[PDB]
Amino acid sequence: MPYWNDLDGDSQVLNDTDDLVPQKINAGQDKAVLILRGNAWSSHDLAATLSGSD
Amino acid sequence: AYTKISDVIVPELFNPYVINTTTQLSAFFQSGIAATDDELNALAKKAGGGSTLN
């Protein structure tokens, strides 16, 4: 995702025998990450019926 | 002359489909062991499974 940084700078000495100069603007970047996970588990059977509960 | 069985095409026949009884024999019943009892009924069926009790 992008962004626009705000302006800054001096004013100037407003004066003759010379002219002004305009100025500019910049831009910028931003990132992120996707991640993903999972697991599992299991059992036997014979044990289940022999143990008295599930 | 004749229609002459030596001429007409004869089909065949299959009648499905039969199980074959199996030897040898097994009986030896009833005897020890026969005759279900109850204490074993406490034995086998869950819950509070085995192995076997006293």
Backbone angles phi, psi at A28, to 5 degrees: -160, 170
The residue type at B48 = G
Residue A49 makes CB contacts below 8 A (sequence gap 6+) with B46, B49
> Which residue(s) pair with A28 in the sheet?
A3
User: CA A35, CA A15: separation in Å to the nearest integer?
Assistant: 59
CB A26 within 8 A of CB A2: no
A46 in B contact zone (CB under 8 Å): no
Bond from prior residue into B17 cis (ω within 30 degrees of 0): yes
Distance from CA of A42 to the nearest CA of B (A): 21
**Do residue B49 and residue A51 have CB atoms under 8 angstroms apart?**
yes
Per the entry, the structure determination technique was cryo-EM
Q: How many CB atoms lie within 10 A of CB A37?
A: 4
Nearest CA in chain B to A50: B49
**Residue of A46, A5, A11, A27 lying closest to B49 (CA atoms):** A46
